[PDB]
Amino acid sequence: HEFAELFYRTYIVTPDQAGFQLSIRRNLVWEGWTGEGLSGEKQEISKRNILQGLLDYTTLETNSTELIPVIQSGENDEQFIDPSVLPAQTVKQGKDTFDTNFLKFSENGEGFNLLMLAQTPSRLKKGSMTFTDSLDSRIALKQLLISVTKGGTTELFALDVNRDQYAAYTATREYNFRLMQLKFHTSLGLGEESTTVAGAESALLKDLFDLGYRIELDVKVDGEMNVENGNGDTSLRALRLARVFDKEGKEIALTDSRVSAALSGLTVTGVGYSLEARLTNINQLEMGLLIDSDVQKQGFMIPTLPPLVIVKPAMVEDDKTYPRLEALTTAYRIQQMRNNAVTTLLNRADTLKSYLGVGVPHPIESNLGLEGVGQYYVRPYYNEATIDVLNDLNNLTSAAKQTDIQGLIVSKINEMVYTADQLTGYTAALEAAFSGRSPKPHVAIGTDMRLPQYIQINGDDRTVGIGYDYTIARISDLRMKDKIVMTFILPNESEPHPLQHGVLGFIPEYLVDFNMIRNQRIGREIRLTPRYRYFNFLPIMLVINVINLEEAIAQRTALDVNETQVTPAS
Amino acid sequence: FDLGYRIELDVKVDGEMNVENGNGDTSLRALRLARVFDKEGKEIALTDSRVS
């Protein structure tokens, strides 16, 4: 009895209606369109839920105002580094796809215009932008390119020079108040596992690096920039081999035999650099992110089911040949609540197994083949595992075997439940759909008459974990042979909701009594034609197969000890 | 399948049927393979070498 109520809670329907509708309101963020309404610009453009962003980082990130140098061959190739040392780089900015590159160090007496290099196709397409455009209040170096060369072989190193406490432009005391100046004095060091823009460790310094040494390069770069106009320039001033340090972090001479031997043949030069500049749009020029909402209609309605037809003789009333109507009622209860519940639960299990696979979650709103409106909140996830009590048991006393096996099973249940909570983030969804409070998720257990005397521990009580609410359900089913089924239920209220597992449609059905002749045989009839159905909402449910319990309790098991080869084998 | 991919078919089926005489019709309008998902719910282009 309690099994169906726990897994498919009852919803009553007056025989006036056929069902109820579920109108769900969600919020979207997206980019680019036409007009003010409708979805997309010319064809369909995708959206995703914002609550999915609580678990990710790339779906709510914004980059639509930064100034990135953009190539136009034959118009601005002069200031870009020669594309024979490092090829062009494809970056993504807003909606435009284009190639960028590091800017050349301005040799003595030459300048560049920064706002002439910022024309992404969107800014060009959208007309001539605001002329009162001013550069960002903070300007700093992003990357610096150095080229260590040994016998004509070039290896490139892209060092993250950003955030270093001198790589930020500072206001000057001098000339116009818009001349935004920069002076960068420090020594940058290359460690032993230091990455390469071409990947892995460079072969040029491998012999030195293995010997346990790190090198510091003194960087000497100066430049200036107007924070309003765009004309500017910056030149490297020096790069030299300054110091070498050992694994112990002590100063070792550059004249030492080993160090000088390893440093022979090295030449270091500066090639280019990158500038992190942003537009300070006093006037609006960006369509950025959006906030939009749409409603989805789902149709739920309740069928009828074949009549459990009862025939009795007429012209007499009896006690044996006329069984009680109580037999009718009990048969109806059995049909309603036992066969169908288990068969539909098993169908859902196999359906989720086919649609989602084992241990493989999917993003929110990724498919509609699964059923229920629960898809709109939780990540589609199904998981299962097996426990072999014979081989997964190590007990040191024959008196503590049963407590040990209950501990094993409880630990397995705990682990899988917490893993599902991690991978699905159901708590966040329950917080969102239920504002003002955080009812802790409940855990429902579906089991036959065996494990209730193993799942329940008569010692330590952690059957589903600390700080959970749980209900254990026992059924006399045989298809539930040594199965346990786990999923989450809401024990509050009695109305359909995308988070509750499932609701059974139920329209009350009343009998008819009448004298009926059919092919000239005359008798009395009793009829019940039920109207009910099982529906599934929440796409989260876990099952465990338990096996070999009785062999495990019948045979002794003693330890899995790993003999470690002091007897020669290694 | 072994690579770890499931296919999805987009389908639009329309039909009408009468609950008074039992007359009705149904016909298929759209049926084609459109999308191939990865081990995630992230779209995989049909132009990549393996799937293509």
XYZ file of C-alpha atoms in Angstrom:
622
model
C 0.000 0.000 0.000
C 2.436 2.628 1.222
C 4.746 1.936 -1.722
C 2.540 3.589 -4.343
C 1.765 6.520 -2.051
C 5.476 7.104 -1.426
C 6.413 6.891 -5.097
C 3.256 8.199 -6.823
C 1.310 10.475 -4.489
C -2.425 10.728 -5.147
C -4.082 13.659 -6.931
C -7.885 13.754 -6.917
C -9.814 14.982 -9.963
C -13.521 15.751 -10.050
C -15.267 13.891 -12.903
C -16.000 17.296 -14.421
C -12.457 17.887 -15.742
C -10.045 15.672 -17.656
C -6.736 17.028 -16.344
C -4.625 20.037 -15.435
C -2.120 22.192 -17.311
C 1.354 23.228 -16.172
C 2.560 26.685 -17.201
C 6.238 27.143 -16.337
C 7.985 30.515 -16.446
C 11.750 30.589 -17.018
C 14.366 33.300 -17.661
C 16.773 33.361 -20.601
C 19.930 35.183 -21.663
C 21.079 35.438 -25.262
C 22.575 37.683 -27.920
C 21.554 39.216 -31.233
C 18.151 39.446 -32.847
C 15.975 41.618 -35.026
C 13.228 43.961 -33.941
C 12.337 44.101 -30.273
C 10.449 40.797 -29.916
C 10.628 37.262 -31.377
C 13.498 34.761 -31.115
C 16.567 35.034 -33.327
C 17.673 37.375 -36.093
C 17.053 35.461 -39.351
C 16.865 31.850 -38.161
C 16.740 30.195 -34.754
C 19.266 31.396 -32.170
C 19.788 29.272 -29.064
C 19.195 30.250 -25.423
C 19.818 28.515 -22.095
C 18.452 28.852 -18.569
C 20.317 31.212 -16.243
C 20.069 28.871 -13.243
C 22.245 26.476 -15.232
C 24.905 29.158 -14.785
C 25.081 28.478 -11.050
C 27.050 25.328 -11.924
C 29.141 26.690 -14.818
C 31.355 29.680 -15.587
C 31.343 30.204 -19.350
C 27.594 30.596 -19.875
C 27.262 33.929 -18.030
C 30.703 35.436 -18.741
C 30.824 38.707 -20.684
C 33.434 40.127 -23.057
C 32.026 42.844 -25.307
C 33.846 46.076 -24.471
C 37.569 45.216 -24.357
C 39.847 46.671 -27.054
C 41.740 43.925 -28.892
C 44.037 44.654 -31.866
C 42.426 43.361 -35.059
C 44.178 42.544 -38.334
C 43.259 44.236 -41.592
C 45.903 43.213 -44.109
C 46.966 46.166 -46.227
C 45.674 48.765 -43.766
C 47.329 48.101 -40.412
C 49.872 45.293 -40.904
C 52.710 47.721 -40.120
C 52.438 47.810 -36.314
C 51.801 44.068 -35.937
C 54.760 41.756 -35.396
C 55.940 39.929 -38.493
C 53.881 36.716 -38.777
C 56.997 34.578 -39.254
C 57.798 34.136 -35.542
C 54.301 33.540 -34.156
C 51.293 32.952 -36.460
C 47.978 34.789 -36.226
C 45.702 33.934 -33.309
C 41.950 33.426 -33.674
C 40.122 34.988 -30.728
C 36.435 35.533 -30.017
C 35.048 38.977 -29.162
C 31.309 39.424 -28.793
C 29.897 38.267 -32.117
C 32.865 38.918 -34.415
C 35.374 36.218 -35.326
C 38.772 37.562 -36.360
C 42.511 37.080 -35.976
C 44.744 39.012 -33.577
C 48.461 39.177 -32.871
C 51.048 40.772 -30.608
C 52.094 44.335 -31.381
C 55.668 45.150 -32.346
C 57.985 47.036 -30.024
C 58.111 50.529 -31.489
C 61.671 51.093 -32.684
C 63.029 54.564 -31.893
C 60.884 57.449 -33.107
C 57.697 55.753 -34.282
C 54.153 55.555 -32.935
C 50.837 53.758 -33.337
C 47.133 54.540 -32.974
C 45.271 52.235 -30.592
C 41.685 53.146 -31.543
C 42.540 52.543 -35.206
C 43.305 48.900 -34.327
C 40.060 48.253 -32.443
C 37.599 47.991 -35.362
C 35.760 44.756 -34.851
C 33.144 44.214 -37.575
C 30.358 45.006 -35.099
C 31.718 48.492 -34.378
C 32.270 49.129 -38.083
C 28.857 47.725 -39.038
C 26.944 49.583 -36.344
C 28.031 52.963 -37.747
C 30.527 55.466 -36.387
C 30.577 54.994 -32.631
C 30.716 57.628 -29.899
C 33.487 60.168 -30.432
C 33.684 60.960 -26.711
C 35.162 57.483 -26.261
C 37.808 57.375 -23.540
C 40.137 54.528 -22.679
C 39.706 52.525 -19.476
C 40.925 54.105 -16.233
C 43.351 51.196 -15.737
C 45.750 50.142 -18.500
C 48.244 47.310 -18.131
C 50.381 44.862 -20.076
C 48.796 41.483 -20.781
C 51.589 39.382 -22.303
C 55.211 39.908 -23.313
C 57.038 37.858 -25.942
C 60.668 36.807 -25.453
C 62.693 34.688 -27.862
C 65.630 32.671 -26.535
C 67.786 31.655 -29.493
C 70.667 29.180 -29.699
C 72.302 28.558 -33.062
C 69.430 29.927 -35.140
C 66.674 28.001 -33.331
C 63.865 30.134 -31.896
C 61.695 29.211 -28.910
C 58.909 31.548 -27.820
C 57.796 32.170 -24.239
C 54.512 33.921 -23.465
C 54.867 35.073 -19.856
C 51.826 36.309 -17.967
C 53.221 39.742 -17.126
C 49.754 40.907 -16.079
C 49.054 41.809 -12.426
C 52.756 42.293 -11.744
C 52.923 45.282 -9.458
C 54.640 47.566 -11.969
C 52.917 46.613 -15.242
C 50.060 49.066 -14.665
C 50.040 52.476 -16.326
C 50.329 55.314 -13.816
C 49.375 58.957 -14.204
C 52.266 61.328 -14.835
C 53.175 64.584 -13.101
C 54.121 66.014 -16.469
C 52.842 67.590 -19.706
C 49.134 67.267 -20.564
C 46.936 65.519 -18.020
C 45.859 62.861 -20.538
C 49.367 61.506 -21.236
C 49.058 58.145 -19.496
C 52.563 56.876 -18.858
C 54.108 53.503 -18.040
C 57.459 52.514 -16.501
C 58.067 48.800 -15.906
C 61.194 47.809 -13.934
C 61.662 44.268 -12.631
C 63.294 40.886 -13.185
C 61.183 37.961 -14.405
C 62.326 34.395 -13.819
C 61.822 31.195 -15.788
C 61.403 28.115 -13.627
C 62.100 24.496 -14.435
C 58.563 23.327 -15.319
C 57.808 26.663 -16.983
C 55.330 26.257 -19.819
C 55.915 27.109 -23.473
C 53.544 28.827 -25.882
C 54.611 26.025 -28.239
C 54.040 23.512 -25.429
C 56.106 21.443 -23.000
C 59.653 22.263 -21.891
C 61.979 23.963 -24.354
C 64.893 21.860 -25.581
C 67.318 24.804 -25.541
C 67.496 24.950 -21.725
C 66.830 21.268 -20.979
C 70.431 20.481 -20.026
C 70.576 23.465 -17.654
C 67.092 22.861 -16.278
C 67.728 19.246 -15.303
C 70.909 20.251 -13.430
C 68.642 22.068 -10.976
C 68.800 25.724 -11.972
C 66.368 28.586 -12.548
C 67.163 31.736 -14.520
C 66.064 35.328 -13.964
C 65.880 37.790 -16.855
C 66.015 41.516 -16.151
C 63.262 43.286 -18.099
C 63.702 46.950 -18.992
C 60.723 48.390 -20.876
C 59.356 51.933 -21.111
C 56.490 53.532 -22.996
C 53.684 56.060 -22.995
C 50.068 56.331 -24.106
C 47.358 58.973 -24.385
C 44.292 57.820 -22.461
C 42.076 59.918 -24.731
C 43.425 60.029 -28.300
C 45.063 56.781 -29.413
C 48.497 57.869 -30.637
C 51.213 56.224 -28.563
C 54.259 53.989 -28.558
C 56.331 51.713 -26.334
C 59.830 50.284 -26.765
C 61.883 47.631 -25.039
C 65.071 48.999 -23.543
C 66.983 45.944 -22.280
C 66.855 42.187 -21.677
C 69.874 40.396 -20.231
C 70.824 37.179 -18.460
C 70.881 38.425 -14.863
C 71.000 35.629 -12.278
C 70.829 31.852 -11.961
C 69.460 30.093 -8.878
C 69.719 26.460 -7.787
C 67.150 24.071 -6.297
C 68.037 25.328 -2.813
C 67.402 28.942 -3.811
C 70.973 30.176 -3.326
C 72.839 32.615 -5.544
C 75.316 30.823 -7.816
C 77.878 32.617 -9.962
C 77.318 33.120 -13.677
C 81.094 32.588 -13.964
C 80.871 29.082 -12.462
C 82.052 26.311 -14.780
C 78.770 24.386 -14.969
C 76.513 27.448 -15.117
C 78.626 29.319 -17.673
C 78.896 26.114 -19.701
C 75.113 25.723 -19.755
C 74.467 29.419 -20.505
C 76.803 29.460 -23.525
C 75.041 30.059 -26.845
C 71.940 31.751 -25.404
C 70.598 35.015 -26.822
C 67.450 36.680 -25.469
C 65.464 39.281 -27.401
C 62.140 41.069 -27.110
C 59.685 40.730 -29.978
C 56.215 41.977 -29.093
C 53.615 42.657 -26.445
C 49.867 42.772 -25.856
C 47.776 45.554 -24.352
C 44.705 45.076 -22.164
C 42.711 48.209 -22.953
C 38.989 48.683 -22.456
C 36.569 51.266 -23.776
C 34.904 53.499 -21.188
C 31.670 54.037 -23.090
C 30.052 57.124 -21.646
C 27.488 56.592 -24.402
C 25.856 53.209 -24.908
C 27.117 51.015 -27.744
C 26.553 47.423 -26.618
C 23.680 44.946 -26.724
C 25.468 42.696 -24.199
C 23.347 40.102 -22.412
C 19.544 39.888 -22.348
C 16.759 38.883 -19.968
C 13.769 37.206 -21.629
C 11.052 34.793 -20.563
C 8.958 32.150 -22.304
C 6.183 29.801 -21.187
C 5.784 26.120 -22.071
C 2.453 24.293 -22.239
C 2.239 20.589 -21.370
C -0.955 18.554 -21.673
C -1.977 16.174 -18.890
C -5.266 14.261 -19.053
C -6.657 11.096 -17.478
C -7.863 7.924 -19.287
C -10.214 5.102 -18.424
C -9.177 1.474 -17.965
C -10.875 -1.833 -18.865
C -13.757 -2.838 -16.596
C -13.244 -5.444 -13.918
C -16.528 -7.136 -14.781
C -18.371 -9.203 -12.176
C -21.171 -11.646 -13.029
C -23.581 -13.217 -10.519
C -26.734 -15.309 -10.974
C -30.130 -13.682 -10.613
C -33.279 -14.606 -8.688
C -31.230 -15.501 -5.584
C -28.751 -14.010 -3.122
C -25.989 -16.067 -1.563
C -22.822 -16.026 0.540
C -20.501 -18.307 -1.449
C -21.714 -18.267 -5.063
C -22.513 -14.624 -4.355
C -19.189 -13.293 -3.016
C -19.181 -10.022 -1.099
C -18.780 -6.742 -2.972
C -15.777 -6.508 -0.664
C -14.103 -8.936 -3.072
C -14.738 -6.410 -5.846
C -13.290 -3.576 -3.773
C -10.183 -5.542 -2.772
C -9.538 -6.667 -6.343
C -9.876 -3.058 -7.491
C -7.413 -1.921 -4.817
C -4.894 -4.565 -5.897
C -5.175 -3.651 -9.585
C -4.842 0.046 -8.777
C -1.942 -0.097 -6.412
C 0.308 -3.117 -6.851
C 0.768 -4.469 -10.390
C 0.781 -1.134 -12.215
C 2.975 0.765 -9.747
C 5.805 -1.750 -9.935
C 5.531 -2.218 -13.699
C 5.623 1.528 -14.388
C 8.500 2.017 -11.942
C 10.513 -0.657 -13.741
C 9.593 0.911 -17.084
C 10.897 4.266 -15.850
C 14.094 2.603 -14.638
C 14.797 1.019 -18.019
C 13.723 4.162 -19.885
C 16.190 6.312 -17.952
C 18.861 3.648 -18.448
C 18.393 3.826 -22.213
C 18.028 7.606 -22.463
C 20.757 8.799 -20.083
C 23.148 5.919 -19.441
C 24.894 5.126 -16.176
C 26.668 7.905 -14.295
C 26.455 10.335 -17.231
C 24.682 13.630 -16.421
C 23.344 16.009 -19.077
C 22.883 19.804 -18.962
C 19.563 21.382 -17.999
C 17.019 21.354 -20.841
C 18.957 19.002 -23.104
C 16.257 16.550 -24.191
C 12.489 16.079 -24.189
C 12.396 12.315 -24.752
C 12.303 11.845 -20.997
C 8.987 12.646 -19.404
C 7.864 15.135 -16.805
C 8.381 18.874 -16.482
C 11.203 18.164 -14.052
C 13.672 18.525 -16.930
C 13.551 22.315 -16.555
C 15.290 22.354 -13.148
C 17.545 19.335 -12.596
C 20.371 17.852 -14.652
C 19.209 14.573 -16.238
C 21.061 11.859 -14.330
C 20.615 8.136 -13.678
C 23.005 5.867 -11.792
C 23.196 2.282 -10.560
C 25.712 -0.077 -8.974
C 26.003 -3.609 -7.603
C 27.172 -4.756 -4.171
C 28.647 -8.236 -3.680
C 28.368 -9.003 0.021
C 30.482 -12.141 -0.393
C 33.641 -10.438 -1.679
C 33.125 -6.887 -0.365
C 33.231 -8.045 3.269
C 36.171 -8.311 5.680
C 35.196 -9.174 9.260
C 37.526 -10.062 12.118
C 34.958 -11.858 14.294
C 32.050 -14.168 13.546
C 29.937 -12.274 16.097
C 30.224 -8.922 14.289
C 29.536 -10.139 10.736
C 25.980 -8.792 10.537
C 26.879 -5.344 11.857
C 29.731 -5.222 9.355
C 27.443 -6.018 6.414
C 24.874 -3.424 7.492
C 27.699 -0.901 7.739
C 28.801 -1.829 4.219
C 25.329 -1.354 2.748
C 24.707 1.909 4.600
C 28.055 3.292 3.434
C 27.246 2.406 -0.179
C 23.840 4.098 0.032
C 25.377 7.187 1.637
C 28.089 7.486 -0.997
C 25.762 7.191 -3.978
C 23.243 9.648 -2.508
C 25.885 12.304 -1.844
C 27.348 11.715 -5.307
C 23.946 12.293 -6.909
C 23.500 15.453 -4.831
C 26.843 16.706 -6.139
C 26.286 15.848 -9.798
C 22.677 17.066 -9.994
C 22.648 20.115 -7.725
C 19.092 19.272 -6.689
C 19.430 21.453 -3.586
C 19.826 24.597 -5.689
C 16.738 23.710 -7.723
C 14.698 23.057 -4.578
C 15.879 26.385 -3.166
C 14.829 28.185 -6.346
C 11.406 26.576 -6.763
C 10.760 27.078 -3.031
C 11.624 30.649 -2.052
C 11.854 31.809 1.548
C 13.092 28.553 3.061
C 15.282 25.533 2.362
C 13.438 22.280 3.144
C 16.084 19.570 3.090
C 15.532 16.992 0.313
C 13.863 13.758 1.427
C 15.118 10.290 0.464
C 12.737 7.516 -0.586
C 13.710 3.833 -0.447
C 11.987 1.074 -2.415
C 12.703 -2.400 -1.100
C 11.130 -5.834 -0.590
C 10.815 -7.726 2.720
C 14.525 -8.594 3.075
C 16.728 -5.515 3.453
C 14.524 -3.736 6.050
C 16.360 -6.028 8.466
C 19.731 -5.002 7.007
C 19.277 -1.358 5.957
C 18.080 -0.513 9.465
C 21.144 -0.682 11.686
C 20.529 -1.576 15.335
C 23.817 0.191 16.083
C 24.913 3.320 14.230
C 22.008 5.050 12.473
C 23.223 6.671 9.256
C 20.983 4.705 6.896
C 20.720 7.557 4.382
C 23.059 9.994 6.139
C 23.237 12.751 8.709
C 20.704 15.523 8.174
C 18.353 13.671 5.843
C 14.703 12.770 6.172
C 13.924 9.305 4.865
C 11.155 6.722 4.610
C 11.699 2.996 4.067
C 8.977 1.221 2.092
C 8.449 -2.543 2.068
C 6.570 -4.406 -0.668
C 5.646 -8.062 -1.181
C 6.509 -7.841 -4.896
C 8.512 -10.630 -6.499
C 9.816 -8.611 -9.460
C 11.453 -6.549 -6.695
C 13.716 -9.532 -5.943
C 16.753 -8.138 -4.048
C 16.355 -4.635 -5.503
C 16.597 -1.251 -3.817
C 15.397 1.898 -5.593
C 16.337 5.408 -4.485
C 15.001 8.817 -5.478
C 13.925 12.107 -3.950
C 10.390 13.011 -2.885
C 8.675 16.099 -1.537
C 6.617 15.249 1.581
C 4.742 18.591 1.620
C 1.426 19.506 -0.038
C -0.569 17.381 -2.488
C -0.438 19.207 -5.842
C 1.531 18.547 -9.050
C 4.936 20.218 -9.118
C 8.014 19.810 -11.342
C 10.111 18.595 -8.388
C 7.851 15.844 -7.008
C 8.550 12.446 -8.539
C 5.131 11.592 -9.930
C 1.405 12.032 -9.503
C -1.280 9.436 -10.177
C -4.337 10.725 -11.990
C -7.460 9.465 -10.213
C -11.089 10.225 -11.073
C -13.462 8.373 -8.701
C -15.446 5.601 -10.355
C -18.778 4.227 -9.151
C -20.409 0.905 -9.951
C -23.620 0.128 -11.835
C -26.136 -2.558 -10.825
C -28.812 -3.743 -13.238
C -30.519 -6.800 -14.690
C -29.073 -7.584 -18.118
C -30.016 -10.215 -20.701
C -27.279 -11.171 -23.169
C -27.885 -13.944 -25.714
C -31.039 -15.025 -23.809
C -29.168 -15.834 -20.605
C -30.479 -13.749 -17.716
C -28.366 -12.675 -14.757
C -27.132 -9.777 -12.670
C -24.007 -7.742 -13.434
C -21.668 -5.617 -11.319
C -19.225 -3.274 -13.044
C -16.220 -1.117 -12.212
C -14.446 0.710 -15.046
C -11.550 2.552 -13.391
C -10.093 5.903 -14.471
C -6.492 6.314 -13.325
C -2.976 6.725 -14.677
C 0.625 7.035 -13.467
C 2.731 10.021 -14.523
C 6.425 10.726 -13.952
C 7.918 14.166 -13.258
C 11.350 14.014 -11.629
C 14.177 12.558 -13.755
C 16.419 11.510 -10.838
C 16.399 7.950 -9.523
C 19.020 5.409 -8.456
C 18.893 1.629 -8.052
C 21.257 -0.846 -6.381
C 21.367 -4.575 -7.017
C 22.318 -6.631 -3.954
C 23.557 -10.180 -4.475
C 25.133 -13.145 -2.678
C 23.886 -12.139 0.784
C 23.183 -15.686 1.950
C 26.491 -17.080 0.706
C 28.148 -14.182 2.525
C 26.400 -15.010 5.789
C 26.963 -18.760 5.352
C 30.694 -18.790 4.508
C 33.539 -17.139 6.385
C 35.617 -14.387 4.778
C 39.010 -13.369 6.149
C 41.018 -10.433 4.842
C 42.544 -9.396 1.532
C 46.232 -8.995 2.348
C 48.633 -7.695 -0.271
C 51.845 -9.737 -0.055
C 54.649 -7.296 -0.882
C 57.600 -9.008 -2.423
C 60.262 -9.128 0.223
C 60.260 -12.569 -1.237
C 62.101 -11.636 -4.434
C 59.720 -10.614 -7.209
C 60.689 -6.939 -7.516
C 27.832 3.877 -30.348
C 31.288 2.778 -29.186
C 32.634 6.315 -29.582
C 29.927 7.345 -27.113
C 27.400 9.116 -29.316
C 23.611 9.109 -29.539
C 21.659 10.363 -32.544
C 18.514 12.489 -32.401
C 15.796 12.610 -35.058
C 13.511 15.632 -35.362
C 9.962 14.552 -36.208
C 6.691 16.383 -36.817
C 3.706 14.038 -37.132
C 0.183 15.393 -37.554
C -3.114 13.561 -37.694
C -6.832 13.870 -37.114
C -9.420 11.338 -35.979
C -13.139 11.491 -35.198
C -14.658 10.004 -32.041
C -18.114 9.586 -33.570
C -17.680 7.231 -36.541
C -14.050 6.213 -36.274
C -12.912 8.024 -39.412
C -9.537 9.747 -39.470
C -6.152 10.134 -41.105
C -2.521 10.674 -40.121
C 0.556 11.538 -42.186
C 4.237 12.232 -41.566
C 5.570 15.684 -42.386
C 9.217 15.776 -41.276
C 11.673 12.943 -40.623
C 15.457 13.327 -40.704
C 18.620 13.057 -38.628
C 19.671 16.520 -37.446
C 21.793 16.482 -34.289
C 24.430 14.214 -32.757
C 25.220 14.641 -29.063
C 28.506 13.877 -27.316
C 29.024 12.327 -23.883
C 27.463 15.639 -22.808
C 24.453 17.593 -23.995
C 26.696 19.749 -26.170
C 26.074 19.755 -29.908
C 28.639 18.001 -32.104
C 29.053 19.211 -35.672
C 28.231 16.681 -38.380
C 31.204 17.915 -40.430
C 33.923 16.570 -38.118
C 35.902 13.737 -39.671
C 34.739 10.881 -37.443
C 30.994 11.556 -37.493
C 30.950 12.727 -41.118
